[PDB]
Design an enzyme around this catalytic site. Structure first.
Site, PDB file in Angstrom:
ATOM      1  N   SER A 130       0.863  -1.206   0.000  1.00  0.00           N
ATOM      2  CA  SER A 130       0.000   0.000   0.000  1.00  0.00           C
ATOM      3  C   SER A 130       0.886   1.238   0.000  1.00  0.00           C
ATOM      4  CB  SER A 130      -1.005  -0.071   1.144  1.00  0.00           C
ATOM      5  OG  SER A 130      -2.091   0.850   0.909  1.00  0.00           O
ATOM      6  N   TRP A 155      -0.262   2.235  -3.079  1.00  0.00           N
ATOM      7  CA  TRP A 155      -0.934   3.536  -2.954  1.00  0.00           C
ATOM      8  C   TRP A 155       0.132   4.623  -3.107  1.00  0.00           C
ATOM      9  CZ3 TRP A 155      -1.017   8.144  -0.525  1.00  0.00           C
ATOM     10  CH2 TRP A 155      -2.223   8.835  -0.403  1.00  0.00           C
ATOM     11  N   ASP A 176      -9.979  -3.958  -4.561  1.00  0.00           N
ATOM     12  CA  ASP A 176      -9.362  -2.927  -3.707  1.00  0.00           C
ATOM     13  C   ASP A 176     -10.202  -1.652  -3.750  1.00  0.00           C
ATOM     14  OD1 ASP A 176      -7.631  -1.225  -2.302  1.00  0.00           O
ATOM     15  OD2 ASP A 176      -5.816  -2.374  -3.059  1.00  0.00           O
ATOM     16  N   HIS A 208      -7.848  -5.209  -0.572  1.00  0.00           N
ATOM     17  CA  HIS A 208      -6.588  -4.463  -0.312  1.00  0.00           C
ATOM     18  C   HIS A 208      -5.671  -5.244   0.628  1.00  0.00           C
ATOM     19  CE1 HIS A 208      -4.136  -0.985  -0.085  1.00  0.00           C
ATOM     20  NE2 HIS A 208      -4.162  -0.999   1.241  1.00  0.00           N
TER      21      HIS A 208
END
Length: 258
Positions: A130, A155, A176, A208
């Protein structure tokens, strides 16, 4: 002969098993001992040799506990792996890049002789979950001498990774809702240069948090990526190219790689 080749001839079964063939030990890195990151755990093969070294970052609010399985599993295939804690749970991707960098420097220079003796400091990789995966992309852009980068459900607010030349495998999760593949993983993959070794593997029926639970697909493809790019292990190209068919929703690559 490939001086970096380690371990037996691979199969799907050996790559999907909870453990590879190397017995693993751990070295604690306290917060006090760690300069530039929050500490962590180093997983290393007991068998004396040199191996590639890997640093792995968790995501927002996450700790090394969320990525411990992946550190142990990769180390069991003949790598020295550090799973970090961040200085704070609030640290953003670009900070997680700096902390990954500090963790690689720690393993090379400041860990025990047991760990330092097991590292080929010229063959390094980074991974993360992430915001840790955003950190992976940022460090790859800053450190082109890294051999591989594996962002897991990454991310990052920056969508343009056209500066990255490190062979990069992005693993997305179809369902996700925190780092949706349409706004994070796919734009990242699409902006990486067409001229590098890269792949995008989207998990089917995955949230996720797929990378926080032992996962045979993540384990199989992470190890195969590290074997080919960190060890030049030609035995592992068969898993990457052409790679998996439509629990994989899609696989894109710049295969063939060899």
């Amino acid at each position: 002969a490939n001086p970096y080749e380690r371990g037996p001839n691979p199969t799907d079964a050996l790559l999907e098993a909870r453990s590879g063939p190397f017995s693993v030990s751990e070295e604690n890195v306290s917060r006090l001992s760690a300069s530039g990151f929050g500490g962590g755990t180093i997983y290393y093969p007991r068998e004396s040799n040199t191996y590639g070294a890997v640093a792995i970052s968790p995501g927002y609010t996450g700790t090394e506990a969320s990525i411990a399985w992946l550190g142990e599993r990769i180390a069991s295939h003949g790598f020295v792996v550090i799973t970090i804690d961040t200085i704070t749970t609030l640290d953003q991707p670009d900070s997680r890049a700096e902390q990954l960098n500090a963790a690689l420097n720690h393993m090379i220079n400041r860990a025990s002789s047991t760990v330092r003796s097991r590292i080929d400091s010229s063959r390094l990789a980074v991974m993360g979950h992430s915001m840790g995966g955003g950190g992976t992309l940022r460090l790859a852009s800053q450190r082109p001498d890294l051999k591989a980068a594996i962002p897991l459900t990454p991310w990052h607010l920056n969508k343009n990774w056209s500066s990255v030349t490190v062979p990069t495998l992005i693993i997305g999760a179809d369902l996700d809702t925190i780092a949706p593949v349409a706004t994070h993983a796919k734009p990242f993959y699409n902006s990486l240069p067409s001229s590098i070794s890269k792949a995008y593997l989207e998990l089917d029926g995955a949230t996720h948090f797929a990378p926080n639970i032992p996962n045979k697909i993540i384990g199989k493809y992470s190890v195969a990526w590290l074997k080919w790019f960190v060890d030049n292990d030609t035995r592992y190209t068969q898993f990457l190219c052409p790679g998996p068919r439509d629990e994989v929703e899609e696989y894109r690559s710049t295969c063939p790689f060899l």
